[PDB]
RNA sequence: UAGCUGGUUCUCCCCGAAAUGACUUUAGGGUCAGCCUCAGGCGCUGACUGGGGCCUGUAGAGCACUGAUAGGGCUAGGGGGC
């Protein structure tokens, strides 16, 4: 048993999502596509309306 | 700082919206609900349909109520004439 194949067993999918591309999450990048979508939104937790 | 404008880069596969309601110094922004999706759980219930019961005041019609209305009759009131 050696370093060739001691790999992460059948999980731990370190693959984050990349929303810059021409397919999948794209252009608008992730759930956006409108406005007040830029630096941040006010909360909600407590804050808002 | 910018609740505004612009821009956001490889591939294939499955599903697939909304542009409504409530509140908002709210109205091209938001929070909750509605609608989308994924995971786990329940498992014949779901849309649609057959049979039966109850709830209803629209279309149409009607003048019994509330009002409107043409002609005639009968008839207080008022008007003209003896
Ligand atoms: Mg990346
Ligand atoms: Mg990128
Ligand atoms: Mg994807
Ligand atoms: Mg997409
Ligand atoms: Mg815009
Ligand atoms: Mg818009
Ligand atoms: Mg901001
Ligand atoms: Mg799918
Ligand atoms: Mg389809
Ligand atoms: Mg109210
Ligand atoms: Mg605004
Ligand atoms: Mg919401
Ligand atoms: Mg069934
Ligand atoms: Mg009736
Ligand atoms: Mg009618
Ligand atoms: Mg009668
Ligand atoms: Mg009457
Ligand atoms: Mg009365
Ligand atoms: Mg008479
Ligand atoms: Mg008289």
Swiss-Prot record:
Basic and acidic residues compositional bias, start-end: 40-49
Where is the segment annotated Disordered? 1-49
Compositional bias (Basic residues): 26-35
Q: Which family does it belong to?
A: Belongs to the universal ribosomal protein uL15 family.
Which purpose does this protein serve, as stated in its record? Binds to the 23S rRNA.
User: Subunit arrangement?
Assistant: Part of the 50S ribosomal subunit.
Name this polypeptide is given? Large ribosomal subunit protein uL15
Q: Which residues of the full protein are shown?
A: 5 to 53 of 150
């Amino acid at each position: 048993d050696l370093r060739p194949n001691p790999g992460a067993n059948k999980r731990r999918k370190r693959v984050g999502r990349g929303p810059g591309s021409g397919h999948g999450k794209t252009a608008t990048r992730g759930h956006k596509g409108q406005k007040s979508r830029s630096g941040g939104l006010k909360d909600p937790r407590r804050f808002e309306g």
